[PDB]
Design a protein around this ligand. Structure first.
Ligand SMILES: Nc1ncnc2c1ncn2[C@@H]1O[C@H](COP(=O)(O)O)[C@@H](OP(=O)(O)O)[C@H]1O
Ligand SMILES: O=[N+]([O-])c1cc(N[C@@H]2CCN(Cc3c[nH]c4ccccc34)C2)ccc1CO
Length: 259
């Protein structure tokens, strides 16, 4: 196809939860659009200064009134969210995914994605990487690797609070598998009931380029396979190598495309 000059604004809002292929999707959107896509890894590796900004936004989010019409308080919150996303062409992952409805209002010309997978595979992946049970010995290893990356209690608070915001819960028993599974199913159901279907594409892991590129009116990138990164096995290796070498820069060359 012809090359056209794309606007550097949010063009794709992905509502999928962590551990549903968000990093591969992030990489895929950056291959298509040649501009950055938001993701929790953007915060971890490029923009830890954003942690407090996302925390402030979640803290004030209860004041949003779903538009239309637009209230004064909502505009103030939307302005901060637009500021956080300046320079990006898409959003994925926590902490953005719980804001998908508000992002749809801020960027009316953006298309919406929902990545989904088997709920038990999701939970298993979540427990290995993002939300290990309190008494899981592996939690201590993740925390040791987190410290190497400069991630402290404020990051943990953002993870918890942005998950609670996505699930619309005032509090959450993070150690209760049944609660998480029910929140997952309810979240994915609500996305599909909220987003007009002409504006939504549901992607399952393994769908690859074709449905995505058709939805976005772009050509399939020539000779580039659809990304497959961020398996829990690979994250486990990253945690162990962070613990072994005690720096990211000692090992980053060992983790292409993930970092
Ligand atoms: N192209 C692809 N095909 C199949 N699974 C994929 C994939 N890209 C990512 N995944 C899976 O999506 C999960 C990562 O999602 P996220 O990037 O949102 O954290 C991992 O699951 P597992 O941990 O079960 O391996 C990863 O293996
Ligand atoms: O938030 N996400 O969705 C998320 C978190 C992380 N990385 C972090 C690794 C360490 N954190 C796990 C953890 C260890 N102790 C805790 C105590 C309380 C709460 C959590 C923890 C999460 C990586 C990716 C993602 C999405 O891409």
């Amino acid at each position: 196809g012809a090359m056209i000059e794309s606007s550097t604004t949010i063009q794709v809002i992905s509502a999928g939860l962590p551990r549903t292929g968000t990093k591969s999707l992030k990489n895929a959107l950056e291959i298509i659009y040649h501009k950055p896509c938001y993701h929790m890894f953007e915060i971890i590796f490029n923009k830890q200064s954003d942690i407090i900004k996302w925390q402030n936004l979640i803290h004030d989010s209860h004041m949003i009134t779903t538009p239309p019409p637009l209230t004064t308080k909502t505009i103030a919150i939307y302005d901060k969210l637009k500021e956080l996303l300046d320079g990006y062409i898409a959003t994925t992952d926590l902490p953005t995914c719980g804001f998908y409805k508000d992002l749809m209002n801020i960027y009316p010309n953006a298309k919406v994605l929902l990545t989904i997978r088997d709920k038990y595979d999701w939970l298993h992946s979540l427990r290995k990487v993002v939300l290990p049970k309190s008494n899981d010995p592996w939690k201590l290893k993740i925390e040791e690797g987190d410290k190497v990356l400069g991630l402290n209690s404020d990051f943990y608070k953002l993870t918890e609070d942005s998950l609670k915001f996505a699930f619309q819960k005032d509090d959450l028993n993070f150690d209760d598998d049944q609660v998480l599974l029910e929140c997952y199913d309810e979240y994915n159901r609500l996305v599909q009931e909220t987003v007009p279907s002409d504006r939504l594409l549901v992607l399952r892991l393994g769908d690859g380029w074709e449905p995505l590129c058709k939805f976005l009116n772009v050509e399939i990138p020539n000779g580039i396979d659809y990304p497959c990164v961020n398996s829990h096995h690979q994250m486990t290796q990253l945690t162990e190598q962070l613990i072994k070498y005690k720096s990211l820069d000692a090992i980053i060359h060992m983790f292409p495309d993930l970092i």
